[PDB]
Design an enzyme around this catalytic site. Structure first.
Site, PDB file in Angstrom:
ATOM      1  N   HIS A 143       0.844  -1.215   0.000  1.00  0.00           N
ATOM      2  CA  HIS A 143       0.000   0.000   0.000  1.00  0.00           C
ATOM      3  C   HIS A 143       0.878   1.263   0.000  1.00  0.00           C
ATOM      4  O   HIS A 143       0.640   2.255  -0.729  1.00  0.00           O
ATOM      5  CB  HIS A 143      -0.970  -0.012   1.160  1.00  0.00           C
ATOM      6  CG  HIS A 143      -1.863  -1.199   1.157  1.00  0.00           C
ATOM      7  ND1 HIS A 143      -2.669  -1.525   2.211  1.00  0.00           N
ATOM      8  CD2 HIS A 143      -2.101  -2.131   0.200  1.00  0.00           C
ATOM      9  CE1 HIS A 143      -3.328  -2.640   1.931  1.00  0.00           C
ATOM     10  NE2 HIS A 143      -3.009  -3.011   0.705  1.00  0.00           N
ATOM     11  N   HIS A 184      -9.286  -1.771  -4.992  1.00  0.00           N
ATOM     12  CA  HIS A 184      -8.180  -2.084  -4.102  1.00  0.00           C
ATOM     13  C   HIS A 184      -7.193  -3.097  -4.703  1.00  0.00           C
ATOM     14  O   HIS A 184      -5.997  -3.023  -4.486  1.00  0.00           O
ATOM     15  CB  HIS A 184      -8.668  -2.584  -2.775  1.00  0.00           C
ATOM     16  CG  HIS A 184      -7.558  -2.738  -1.802  1.00  0.00           C
ATOM     17  ND1 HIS A 184      -7.054  -1.676  -1.090  1.00  0.00           N
ATOM     18  CD2 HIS A 184      -6.825  -3.807  -1.455  1.00  0.00           C
ATOM     19  CE1 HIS A 184      -6.057  -2.091  -0.336  1.00  0.00           C
ATOM     20  NE2 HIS A 184      -5.885  -3.373  -0.558  1.00  0.00           N
ATOM     21  N   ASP A 220      -3.412  -2.577  -5.079  1.00  0.00           N
ATOM     22  CA  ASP A 220      -2.366  -3.552  -4.778  1.00  0.00           C
ATOM     23  C   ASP A 220      -1.424  -3.760  -5.970  1.00  0.00           C
ATOM     24  O   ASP A 220      -0.218  -3.921  -5.781  1.00  0.00           O
ATOM     25  CB  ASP A 220      -2.924  -4.933  -4.408  1.00  0.00           C
ATOM     26  CG  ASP A 220      -3.517  -5.012  -3.026  1.00  0.00           C
ATOM     27  OD1 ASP A 220      -3.177  -4.200  -2.161  1.00  0.00           O
ATOM     28  OD2 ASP A 220      -4.362  -5.909  -2.820  1.00  0.00           O
ATOM     29  N   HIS A 226      -0.696 -11.135  -5.017  1.00  0.00           N
ATOM     30  CA  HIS A 226       0.716 -10.785  -4.809  1.00  0.00           C
ATOM     31  C   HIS A 226       1.678 -11.794  -5.410  1.00  0.00           C
ATOM     32  O   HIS A 226       2.657 -11.406  -6.037  1.00  0.00           O
ATOM     33  CB  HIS A 226       1.067 -10.590  -3.317  1.00  0.00           C
ATOM     34  CG  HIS A 226       0.187  -9.621  -2.629  1.00  0.00           C
ATOM     35  ND1 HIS A 226       0.145  -8.278  -2.962  1.00  0.00           N
ATOM     36  CD2 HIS A 226      -0.755  -9.812  -1.678  1.00  0.00           C
ATOM     37  CE1 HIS A 226      -0.758  -7.683  -2.196  1.00  0.00           C
ATOM     38  NE2 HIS A 226      -1.313  -8.590  -1.408  1.00  0.00           N
TER      39      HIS A 226
HETATM   40  C1  LIG Z   1      -7.649  -7.908  -0.064  1.00  0.00           C
HETATM   41  C2  LIG Z   1      -6.321  -8.702  -0.042  1.00  0.00           C
HETATM   42  C3  LIG Z   1      -5.641  -8.628  -1.408  1.00  0.00           C
HETATM   43  N1  LIG Z   1      -6.712 -10.086   0.170  1.00  0.00           N
HETATM   44  C4  LIG Z   1      -5.323  -8.311   1.083  1.00  0.00           C
HETATM   45  N2  LIG Z   1      -5.903  -8.115   2.421  1.00  0.00           N
HETATM   46  C5  LIG Z   1      -5.857  -9.051   3.381  1.00  0.00           C
HETATM   47  O1  LIG Z   1      -5.289 -10.127   3.231  1.00  0.00           O
HETATM   48  C6  LIG Z   1      -6.642  -8.879   4.673  1.00  0.00           C
HETATM   49  C7  LIG Z   1      -7.338  -7.682   4.883  1.00  0.00           C
HETATM   50  C8  LIG Z   1      -8.121  -7.495   6.002  1.00  0.00           C
HETATM   51  C9  LIG Z   1      -8.199  -8.508   6.940  1.00  0.00           C
HETATM   52  C10 LIG Z   1      -8.909  -8.301   7.995  1.00  0.00           C
HETATM   53  C11 LIG Z   1      -9.557  -8.115   8.970  1.00  0.00           C
HETATM   54  C12 LIG Z   1     -10.273  -7.965  10.155  1.00  0.00           C
HETATM   55  C13 LIG Z   1     -10.851  -7.925  11.186  1.00  0.00           C
HETATM   56  C14 LIG Z   1     -11.520  -7.899  12.496  1.00  0.00           C
HETATM   57  C15 LIG Z   1     -12.430  -9.120  12.624  1.00  0.00           C
HETATM   58  C16 LIG Z   1     -13.043  -7.706  12.571  1.00  0.00           C
HETATM   59  C17 LIG Z   1     -13.607  -7.079  13.872  1.00  0.00           C
HETATM   60  O2  LIG Z   1     -13.320  -5.666  13.953  1.00  0.00           O
HETATM   61  C18 LIG Z   1      -7.542  -9.728   6.726  1.00  0.00           C
HETATM   62  C19 LIG Z   1      -6.773  -9.941   5.573  1.00  0.00           C
HETATM   63  C20 LIG Z   1      -4.638  -7.028   0.768  1.00  0.00           C
HETATM   64  O3  LIG Z   1      -5.285  -5.987   0.651  1.00  0.00           O
HETATM   65  N3  LIG Z   1      -3.315  -7.138   0.674  1.00  0.00           N
HETATM   66  O4  LIG Z   1      -2.553  -6.062   0.244  1.00  0.00           O
HETATM   67 ZN   LIG Z   2      -3.981  -4.491  -0.286  1.00  0.00          ZN
END
Ligand SMILES: CC(C)(N)[C@H](NC(=O)c1ccc(C#CC#C[C@@H]2C[C@H]2CO)cc1)C(=O)NO
Ligand SMILES: [Zn+2]
Length: 301
Positions: A84, A239, A243, A266
Site C-alpha cells: 500500500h 483495491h 495492490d 501478490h
Molecule cells: C484484499 C487482499 C488482497 N486479500 C489483502 N488483504 C488481506 O489479506 C486482509 C485484509 C483485512 C483482513 C482483515 C480483517 C479484520 C478484522 C476484524 C475481525 C473484525 C472485527 O473488527 C484480513 C486480511 C490485501 O489488501 N493485501 O494487500
Molecule cells: Zn492491499
C-alpha cells in the site's frame, strides 16, 4: 524566464514524514519515517529497530513470501505489507526515499493508500537533477496459474484492468487509465478487505492480528459490516488495482505499459515481474528529454 524542452525528472520527498500505526498482520505498533534520498537510490526499507540497521531495497529480487501480503526479506529480516505504501509512491511518482520502520510490518493506517498520499503531499515532493527512468513494455508478457492470470501489454501510457471472481452476495471489473483517471481520487482511497469466514483461521495462524473495521472493509456472510459502508461502489476491485500498482513498483521504475489482472494477487504479480525482468526483449529503460512529448504526466511537485 525562457521556453525550452525539460527532462521529466526524478523525485524525492521535500520533507520528512513520520507516522505511527499498527501492522495489519502482526498487530505490532510501528513508527514510520519517510526520508528524502539521493538520485537513483530507489525506495529502500530500513529496519531501524535493529542494531545494526538492516536496509532492504524495494525490488523484485528481495521479495520473500507473497501469500498474504508482499514481503521483502534479507537473511532472517523481513519487511511486511509494503504494497500500500509503495502504491502511494508510484501513484505520486516518487523515485527515491528511505522508509524507516521500527518493526517488521508497514502500518496499515485506514487500509488504503489515502493517508500515505496525504502525508506525502503535505510534506511536498522535490524534483531532482537527473532524468527519471521508465520501463517501457515492448512485448506481451503473460503468466498464468490455474484460472489466475496476469499480463503486461505494450501501451503508450499507463493503464490497469482488473477482474475478480468472488461468489458472494456482496457482489467485479474495473479499468483505470492514468490519462483520465486520478490515482489519488479514484484509486488511493480504496481499502483492503477481508471475509469474516477467514478471520479466525487467519488469527489462528497469527495473521490479521491488527485488522478491524477501522482499517478494513469487513464482510460477513451477506453484507459489509463497517457502519458507514463503502467509499466507492466498486471499492473491492479498486483495491486490487491499488495492490497491483504497488506490486508493479517493485520493478524499481514506473511503467509505460498496460497491466491486466484476472484473479491475480501478490504471488502472481511477483511471478509476472520476475518473468518480465528475465525477458529482456520484452522491455527497455527509457527517459524523456521533453515532457511535452512523453506519453505520461505527473502532478506538480
Ligand atoms: C484484499 C487482499 C488482497 N486479500 C489483502 N488483504 C488481506 O489479506 C486482509 C485484509 C483485512 C483482513 C482483515 C480483517 C479484520 C478484522 C476484524 C475481525 C473484525 C472485527 O473488527 C484480513 C486480511 C490485501 O489488501 N493485501 O494487500
Ligand atoms: Zn492491499
Amino acid at each position: 524566464h525562457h521556453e525550452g524542452a525539460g527532462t521529466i525528472k526524478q523525485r524525492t520527498l521535500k520533507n520528512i514524514i513520520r507516522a505511527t500505526g499498527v501492522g495489519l498482520h502482526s498487530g505490532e505498533k510501528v513508527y514510520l519515517t519517510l526520508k528524502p534520498a539521493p538520485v537513483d537510490t530507489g525506495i529502500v526499507f530500513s529496519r531501524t529497530d535493529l542494531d545494526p540497521v538492516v536496509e532492504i531495497p524495494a525490488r523484485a529480487e528481495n521479495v520473500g513470501e507473497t501469500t498474504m501480503s508482499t514481503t521483502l526479506v534479507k537473511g532472517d529480516v523481513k519487511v511486511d505489507t509494503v504494497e500500500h505504501l509503495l502504491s502511494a509512491m508510484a501513484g505520486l511518482g516518487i523515485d527515491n526515499a528511505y522508509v524507516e520502520l521500527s518493526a517488521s510490518e508497514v502500518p496499515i493506517m485506514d487500509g488504503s493508500a489515502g493517508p500515505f498520499v496525504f502525508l506525502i503531499q503535505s510534506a511536498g515532493l522535490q524534483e531532482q537533477e537527473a532524468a527519471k527512468k521508465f520501463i517501457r513494455i515492448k512485448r506481451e508478457v503473460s503468466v498464468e496459474e490455474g484460472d489466475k492470470r496476469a499480463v503486461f501489454v505494450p501501451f503508450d501510457g499507463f493503464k490497469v484492468s482488473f477482474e475478480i471472481d468472488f461468489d458472494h452476495p456482496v457482489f467485479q471489473q474495473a479499468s483505470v487509465d492514468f490519462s483520465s483517471t486520478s490515482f489519488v481520487k479514484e484509486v488511493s482511497r480504496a481499502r483492503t478487505f477481508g471475509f469474516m469466514r477467514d478471520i479466525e483461521y487467519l488469527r489462528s495462524q497469527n495473521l490479521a492480528l491488527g485488522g478491524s473495521v477501522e482499517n478494513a472493509i469487513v464482510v460477513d456472510e451477506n453484507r459489509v459490516l463497517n457502519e458507514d459502508g463503502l467509499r466507492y461502489e466498486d471499492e473491492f476491485v479498486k483495491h486490487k488495482i491499488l495492490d497491483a500498482i504497488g506490486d508493479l513498483y517493485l520493478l524499481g521504475n514506473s511503467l509505460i505499459g498496460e497491466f491486466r489482472g484476472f484473479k491475480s494477487g501478490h504471488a502472481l504479480n511477483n511471478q509476472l515481474l520476475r518473468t518480465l525482468i528475465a525477458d529482456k526483449d520484452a522491455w527497455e529503460v527509457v527517459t524523456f528529454e521533453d515532457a511535452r512529448t512523453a506519453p505520461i504526466s505527473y502532478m506538480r511537485p
